[PDB]
Amino acid sequence: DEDVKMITSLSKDQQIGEKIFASIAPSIYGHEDIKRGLALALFGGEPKNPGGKHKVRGDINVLLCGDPGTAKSQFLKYIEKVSSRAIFTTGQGASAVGLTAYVQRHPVSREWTLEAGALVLADRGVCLIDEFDKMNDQDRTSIHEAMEQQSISISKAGIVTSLQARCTVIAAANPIGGRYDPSLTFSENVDLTEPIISRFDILCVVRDTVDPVQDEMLARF
Amino acid sequence: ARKSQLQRRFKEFLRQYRFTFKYRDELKRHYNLGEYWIEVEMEDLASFDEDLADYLYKQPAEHLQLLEEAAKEVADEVTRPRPSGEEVLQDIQVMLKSDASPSSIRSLKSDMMSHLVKIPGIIIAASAVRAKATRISIQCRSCRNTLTNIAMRPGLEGYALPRKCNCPLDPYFIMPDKCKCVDFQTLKLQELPDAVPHGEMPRHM
Numbered sequence: 480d481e482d483v484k485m486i487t488s489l490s491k492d493q494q495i496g497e498k499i500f501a502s503i504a505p506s507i508y509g510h511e512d513i514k515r516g517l518a519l520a521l522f523g524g525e526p527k528n529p530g531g532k533h534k535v536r537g538d539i540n541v542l543l544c545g546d547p548g549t550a551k552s553q554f555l556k557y558i559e560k561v562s563s564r565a566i567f568t569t570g571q572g573a574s575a576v577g578l579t580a581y582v583q584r585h586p587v588s589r590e591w592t593l594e595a596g597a598l599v600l601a602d603r604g605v606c607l608i609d610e611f612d613k614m615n616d617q618d619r620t621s622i623h624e625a626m627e628q629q630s631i632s633i634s635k636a637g638i639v640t641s642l643q644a645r646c647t648v649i650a651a652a653n654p655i656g657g658r659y660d661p662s663l664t665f666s667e668n669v670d671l672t673e674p675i676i677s678r679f680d681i682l683c684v685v686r687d688t689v690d691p692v693q694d695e696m697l698a699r700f
Numbered sequence: 701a702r703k704s705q706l707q708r709r710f711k712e713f714l715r716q717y718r719f720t721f722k723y724r725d726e727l728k729r730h731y732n733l734g735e736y737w738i739e740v741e742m743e744d745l746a747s748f749d750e751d752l753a754d755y756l757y758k759q760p761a762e763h764l765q766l767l768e769e770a771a772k773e774v775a776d777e778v779t780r781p782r783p784s785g786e787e788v789l790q791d792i793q794v795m796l797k798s799d800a801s802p803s804s805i806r807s808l809k810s811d812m813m814s815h816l817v818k819i820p821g822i823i824i825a826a827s828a829v830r831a832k833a834t835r836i837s838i839q840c841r842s843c844r845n846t847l848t849n850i851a852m853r854p855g856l857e858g859y860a861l862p863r864k865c866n867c868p869l870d871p872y873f874i875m876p877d878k879c880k881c882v883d884f885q886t887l888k889l890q891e892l893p894d895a896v897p898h899g900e901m902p903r904h905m
């Protein structure tokens with residue numbers, strides 16, 4: 480009860496937005512724009528559907544592309560910690576939670592189960608993807624259909640189902656050559672395809688230019 | 701004794717509920733078309749008489765049989781001038797329906813044993829339809845005596861053949877050509893993905 484009053488009092492502050500922006504990722508130095516974009520993604524928007532014909536989503540997907548050593552994974556870990564319903568996965572492989580639905584007997588419970596992908600488990604939540612450029616064909620197709628149609632269709636072992644996958648996707652990636660080239664466009668610097676990139680609302684580019692003062696401050700931290 | 705009175709009450713409810721006789725006409729039409737099954741909305745039963753509706757919630761096994769017998773008697777009384785050849789009165793299955801909100805599958809515990817429950821879920825496996833006996837007959841090895849029309853209990857419950865002949869012990873065998881069978885099937889249900897707790901495995905039934 481008093482929490483609502485405290486929140487309303489905090490909203491009356493003139494610098495509440497700046498405080499919220501600075502609050503995200505206390506242990507990460509710099510990258511104010513990244514934190515602001517992540518705050519905007521976390522707060523989200525509002526979906527619309529005039530009648531039952533035109534559906535417009537309200538989720539803000541975020542993609543970060545950066546050189547090695549720029550602490551891309553720390554942001555994902557912090558977002559996973561903060562978010563109430565967050566599912567973390569990596570495209571390299573051997574992930575705890577898969578990205579494709581399948582029907583199998585569970586190794587532990589020894590029961591016949593239908594295990595959905597991380598996209599379905601993150602319904603009305605957040606899905607974080609690390610190593611976005613190492614994925615295979617199945618993961619790419621599943622992500623494409625989950626981002627365009629916002630649903631997953633399964634036809635396996637006599638089971639035909641359609642499941643909702645309303646989630647916000649935050650992905651991390653590295654350039655093709657290991658270092659971003661300003662002379663080339665963003666599409667040419669990433670192994671991803673144009674339709675996949677077009678889905679993301681916010682694209683962030685991180686570089687590793689040698690600034691002595693910034694490097695000194697980072698080393699001190 | 702009193703169960704006969706309850707069956708009579710169910711008969712009166714079926715014959716009297718209405719400003720048109722819904723269940724009477726529905727049963728007549730279903731019997732005429734050959735579909736020996738009806739669906740009963742428990743709100744109508746509660747409106748007609750709250751006692752039987754309350755009773756059905758706690759002891760479904762016996763009251764369901766009483767209701768089935770009452771429905772069979774009602775169907776027999778409605779269809780007096782049945783065509784020649786169709787003298788046999790066939791049994792009728794009774795289904796239940798209600799508008800009450802469902803309960804989560806995770807709430808199933810010991811206290812809900814042998815009670816009536818409503819559960820949402822998703823089906824993941826369906827076995828083939830097979831046959832289960834309802835009335836069976838047995839024959840003895842030595843004297844060839846016969847016991848006929850033995851009633852079988854519903855559900856996943858077996859039967860034990862008698863060991864004493866009224867001759868060697870355990871002389872009875874089942875005759876396959878003199879039995880009545882019905883269709884049964886087994887299904888697998890899984891917890892809805894929209895209701896599973898975060899970071900926890902789903903449960904099945």
Ligand SMILES: Nc1ncnc2c1ncn2[C@@H]1O[C@H](COP(=O)(O)OP(=O)(O)OP(=O)(O)O)[C@@H](O)[C@H]1O
Pocket residue numbers: 506507508509546547548549550551552553653697700
């Ligand atoms: N701004 C920063 N503030 C604090 N530590 C930082 C910062 N930038 C990088 N680091 C440190 O750099 C190290 C590199 O590991 P980290 O997992 O963060 O890398 P990464 O950017 O995800 O790299 P990769 O491209 O290999 O996946 C970490 O220990 C992290 O603490």
Ligand SMILES: [Mg+2]
Pocket residue numbers: 551552609
């Ligand atoms: Mg990393």
Ligand SMILES: [Zn+2]
Pocket residue numbers: 840841842843844845865866867871
């Ligand atoms: Zn005998």
